[PDB]
Symmetry: C3
Subunit: 64 residues, 3 copies
Amino acid sequence: EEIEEAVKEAELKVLAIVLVALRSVSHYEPLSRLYESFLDALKKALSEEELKEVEKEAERIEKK
Amino acid sequence: EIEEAVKEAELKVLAIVLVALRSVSHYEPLSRLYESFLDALKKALSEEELKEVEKEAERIEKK
Amino acid sequence: REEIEEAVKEAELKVLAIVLVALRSVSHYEPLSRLYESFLDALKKALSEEELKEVEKEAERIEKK
């Protein structure tokens, strides 16, 4: 069925949680290096639309 | 039907990250990422979800 | 069915590969080194050896781009 879709929602939600956490601390040395590392790894591993979906889910979490 | 098993993937990955962050939360500034992560966990998941990551993290820590 | 087991496992292991790649590439800075080692130890407890092997392949895949 749509297993691919359901698998992807879980990926994107976990990765958005990690993104929120790294973002909060991204100006303490050297966590800024891990922030940019994580973002680089997301860009390589996810499609462009998925990456935008991670970033949107992160902002949703960050306004909560 | 299956978002239940979707959820188990989530909580088990989050539990593995939590375990890694707990074992180094005494090396600064990692304690800030440990707290940021617990703060992101609390925001993003219901309390039942949070406690499942916790118990899964305990089962991992006991291995 | 068995399509959901391969599903959950697959989601789990690519996400862990992404985090692994992120940590690996900054592991010389301290104490990011320590969080890297500690992630590797957590993977060793939580994952089987074939799950760990699959995480590392996905990690090399990502690093290769």
